[PDB]
Amino acid sequence: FGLKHPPPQIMIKNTPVPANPPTTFSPAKFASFITQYSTGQVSVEIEWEL
Amino acid sequence: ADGVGNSSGNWHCDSQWLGDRVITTSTRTWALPTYNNHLYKQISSQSGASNDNHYFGYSTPWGYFDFNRFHCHFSPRDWQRLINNNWGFRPKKLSFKLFNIQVKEVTQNDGTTTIANNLTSTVQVFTDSEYQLPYVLGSAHQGCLPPFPADVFMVPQYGYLTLNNGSQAVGRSSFYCLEYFPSQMLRTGNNFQFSYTFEDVPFHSSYAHSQSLDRLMNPLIDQYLYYLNRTQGTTSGTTNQSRLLFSQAGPQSMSLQARNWLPGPCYRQQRLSKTANDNNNSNFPWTAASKYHLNGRDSLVNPGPAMASHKDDEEKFFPMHGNLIFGKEGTTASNAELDNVMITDEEEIRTTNPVATEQYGTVANNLQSSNTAPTTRTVNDQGALPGMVWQDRDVYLQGPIWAKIPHTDGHFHPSPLMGGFGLKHPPPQIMIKNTPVPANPPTTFSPAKFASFITQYSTGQVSVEIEWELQKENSKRWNPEIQYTSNYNKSVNVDFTVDTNGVYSEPRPIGTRYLTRNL
């Protein structure tokens, strides 16, 4: 089936958790994060005509 | 007010364009360490430093939140859209939110480090709505919400200065303890809200002038006012004797007409060519720079009065310390090259404001007579005269938004010389801090100061939202207008995006003044 307005794309992401920052302020880009992942359950349900 | 498994607030960002106003909101992630080991530290300049570079003050364990830059709110597409259709704008309302706060403890036992959650630790936050602490915003300091929403940033440390007699202090100096303020303590689950309303402020002139002060008349009709145009005699035999003669100024003698207004005030600055070899071979800066000194110590006027960068067809000369200079991505902060920086141009105000490199004009300075010929003098520093009309300095996507007008008895033009809107009651400074968590105390009571704390930091999300009023343009110009565009030519990477290494960059400065108006 071709659709002008198909089911939209759901996007998911893990927010970045910074590691311990330097004691003295630095304007440099923060590039030391805590490594972690995520898991969960996803349910889908489609009603179809016959 | 929630538990540990419920999130406070969401990630909003985006912007909304309404009929007469635009709501720009942005969310970022922030980190915060402990500063000065939870100590207030006195800071003096140095022993043997320069007289001008002297200072006395304090540094606190408190951070603060900065969002006083347009690029910390707008986006390149939004900015281009705003400046290509509007004759002005100004802030109307402000909302601020802190949420999703986590306090994380750090442990060190070897070369490795371990980070753990600390659910019972609080965080202190408060806003100086009564404007009692010194205002350090509006000084073009670093550390506002990075231009790219995906960047995680760091909360700058707070500190202030006071009166100093050399490197020392005076009894008139003040000390402010920020723990001496009512502050809100919040754990993982709590959040902080804040709302604010800007006061009345003039619209920013986001347009150039299609006319000029010196050319504001009819190019077809003579004036009915006479002007002295000759002192000798025009007739034969009288060309060598004095005789006053009066003419009427028309389209030809267009520089001798009568006028109503004068160009803005001037404060001359030195000139520099963008080509290195065309300049003088000496270290003249700070020895040939327009500088002002008070209390016996000098200081440099970097922005200075709003004055045109160069004349027409110059495109090569800029005043020394006469315009904002931005840094390109990944540029050293000490002795960078000319091609690694970004010098802003303020030529749009050539019509009203005098050029910075040149003078205001000449004034007679003697009583001419038969024996003595008249003599004039060039004037490079000009104050304020009746009938003076001028224009303010433009603002840029990366430039400052506002500043705090000092609480003094007198003001002439409270518009900041560095940027945009001057406010008597600007958005207050929000300060945030990590409460100190003591380590195990001694078993036997000791009155000594407790100086063994648990090392930990904090992180969270900060949302900001400003509602801005817009002034629409209704121009009767027939031909098209000049506007900001992206070059269509092929390029390795497009402007205002990330490179293969994921580093966001800003290639050029963008000014608001693109549309035109008649004087």
Is the minimum CB–CB distance between B329 and chain A shorter than 8 Å?
no
B190, B101 contact by CB (below 8 A): yes
DSSP state of B79: H
Q: Which residues contact B168 (CB under 8 A, 6 or more apart)?
A: B44, B56
DSSP designation for B78: H
**Distance between CA atoms of B99 and B97, rounded to whole angstroms?**
7
Which of B35, B459, B503 faces A23 most closely, judged by CB atoms? B35
Region for B78 from its dihedrals, namely left if φ exceeds 0, alpha if ψ lies in -120 to 50, beta otherwise: alpha
Residue position matching structure tokens 């409270």: B414
Cα–Cα distances in angstroms (integers) from residue B78 to residues B14, B85, B148, B497, in the given order: 10, 11, 13, 14
Chain A residues with CB-CB distance to B35 below 8 A: 23
Is the Cβ of A14 closer than 8 Å to some Cβ of chain B? no
Q: Is the distance from CB of B230 to CB of B242 less than 8 angstroms? A: no
Q: CB–CB of B395/B87 below 8 Å?
A: no
Residues in chain B within 8 Å Cβ distance of A25: 143, 154-157
Q: Which residues of B406-427 are buried (b: 16+ CB within 10 A; e: fewer)?
A: eeeeeeeeebbebbbbbbeebb
Question: Which residues in chain B touch residue A21, judged by CB atoms under 8 angstroms apart?
Answer: 31-33, 154, 457
Are B154 and A21 inside 8 Å of each other by CB?
Answer: yes
> Contact, B279 vs B270, CB < 8 A?
no
Q: Is B31 on the interface with A (CB under 8 A)?
A: yes
In a 3-state reduction of DSSP, which class is residue B404?
Answer: strand
Residue B347: is it exposed, middle or buried by C-beta count within 10 angstroms (0-12/13-18/19+)?
middle
- Of the candidates B387, B320, B317, which has an alpha carbon nearest to the alpha carbon of residue B347? B317
- Strands B56-64 and B157-162 come out as antiparallel
Query: Considering only CA atoms, which of B125, B20, B18, B15 is closest in space to residue B70?
Result: B15
Q: Is B75 left (phi over 0), alpha (psi -120 to 50) or beta?
A: beta
Provide the sign of the torsion angle of the four alpha carbons B106, B107, B112, B114, taken in this order.
negative
Phi-psi category of residue B207: left, alpha or beta, with phi > 0 → left and psi -120 to 50 → alpha = beta
Half-sphere exposure of residue B26: CA atoms within 13 angstroms, side-chain side: 23
Nearest alpha carbon to residue B245 among B225, B226, B222, B258: B226
Query: Which two structure tokens, joined as six digits, stand for B151?
Result: 């960047």
**Going along B203-256, which residue ranges are E strands?**
207-209, 226-230, 245-248
**CB-CB: which of B142, B457, B461 is closest to A21?**
B457
In this complex, is the C-beta atom of B503 within 8 Å of any C-beta atom belonging to chain A? Answer: yes
Quoted resolution (Å) = 3.1
* Pick among B459, B461, B499, B503 to test the A interface (most A CBs inside 10 A): B459
**How far apart are the C-alpha atoms of B373 and B231, rounded to whole Å?**
12
Backbone angles phi, psi at B279, to 5 degrees: -95, 165
B195: Cβ contacts below 8 Å, ≥ 6 apart = B93, B94, B95, B96
Nearest to B235 by CA among B224, B227, B247, B243: B243
The experimental method is: cryo-EM
How far is Cα B462 from Cα B123, in angstroms, rounded to an integer? 14
Q: Is A15 on the interface with B (CB under 8 A)?
A: yes
Give the list of residues 6+ apart from residue B139 with CB closer than 8 angstroms, or none. Answer: none
Residue A3 distance to chain B (closest CA, Å): 27
Cβ-based burial of B401 (10 A; exposed 0-12, middle 13-18, buried ≥19): buried
Contact criterion met (CB < 8 Å) for A30 and B33? no
Measured CA to CA, the distance from residue B513 to residue B348 in angstroms comes to: 7
Q: Are A47 and B489 in contact (CB under 8 A)?
A: no
Pairing of strands B402-404, B421-423: parallel
Strand-strand pairing, B157-162 and B430-434 = unpaired
Q: Cα dihedral angle (B393, B394, B396, B398), rounded to 10 degrees?
A: 10
Q: How far apart are CA B265 and CA B348, in angstroms?
A: 16
Q: Is B472 left (phi over 0), alpha (psi -120 to 50) or beta?
A: beta
What is the Cα–Cα distance from B454 to B519, expressed in whole angstroms? 65
Encoding tokens for residue B74? 């707008």
B491 vs A: CB within 8 A: no
Per the structure block, which two tokens stand in for B416?
A: 């900041």
All residues at 6 or more sequence positions from B466 whose CB lies less than 8 Å from its CB, including other chains: B23, B24, B25, B73, B91, B92, B93, B94, B95
> Which of A30, A33, A34 is most worth mutating to test chain B (most B CB atoms within 10 A of its CB)?
A30
Query: In this structure, which amino acid lies at residue B517?
Result: R
Structure tokens at B387: 């009938």
Surface-to-core class of residue B314, CB atoms within 10 Å of its CB (0-12 exposed, 13-18 middle, 19+ buried): middle
Q: Are B190 and B100 in contact (CB under 8 A)?
A: no
Best B65, B106, B153 member to test A by mutation, with max A CBs in 10 Å, is B153
Q: How does DSSP classify residue B259?
A: -
By C-alpha distance, the chain A residue nearest B504 is A29
User: In a 3-state reduction of DSSP, which class is residue B25?
Assistant: strand
CB pairs under 8 A between A and B: 51
